[PDB]
Amino acid sequence: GIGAVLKVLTTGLPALISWIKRKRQQ
């Protein structure tokens, strides 16, 4: 289904928030 597929390209990128924001807001 796409429910999540369209929710990945709308905020961050699934886990990116704990990937780059975790590496940038340190």
Side-chain angles (χ1 to χ4, degrees):
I2 58 182
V5 188
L6 317 181
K7 203 227 284 175
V8 179
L9 342 172
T10 15
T11 121
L13 247 153
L16 267 283
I17 328 86
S18 258
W19 219 128
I20 261 69
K21 231 169 174 259
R22 206 188 222 142
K23 198 238 76 65
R24 220 241 154 120
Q25 284 212 258
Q26 194 102 109

